[PDB]
Amino acid sequence: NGKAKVSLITSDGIKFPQDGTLEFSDVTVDQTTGSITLRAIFPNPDHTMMPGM
Amino acid sequence: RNFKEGSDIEAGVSLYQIDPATYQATYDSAKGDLAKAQAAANIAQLTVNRYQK
């Protein structure tokens, strides 16, 4: 009823200290991946996320 | 940015802000020179209105 919730699980095998929102869902399937790019927006007051993982 | 990502946007819905700061000045130069032409054509319009009589 509230769009949406996505959690992370990085290379450790334990989830991220918090979780957040699937902001939107693309409708452009990428040509050379055949794959929708969802965009999940996450809070990071710790800088333990790194753009590109 | 002034839209919501992934949403539906109608035509003409002004939701990016390119920095107006240069283009505000070029607009104010021209809207200056509009009043430079209007005032010079105001009194051009009076000097007919003062000669038509």
Q: Structure resolution in Å?
A: 6.5
Say which amino acid occupies A26.
D
CA distances from A30 to A1, A12, A38, B38, B48 (A): 28, 29, 11, 54, 67
Q: Cis peptide leading into A4, omega within 30 of 0? A: yes
Say which amino acid occupies A30.
D
| Closest approach of A44 to chain B, Cα-based (Å) | 20
Q: Residue with structure tokens 């699980």?
A: A9
Kind of pairing, strands A38-41 and A21-25? antiparallel
Q: How far is the C-alpha of B16 from the C-alpha of B1, rounded, in Å?
A: 5
Chain A residues within an 8 Å CB radius of B7: 24
Quick count: other Cβ atoms within 10 Å of Cβ B21? 7
Experimental method: cryo-EM
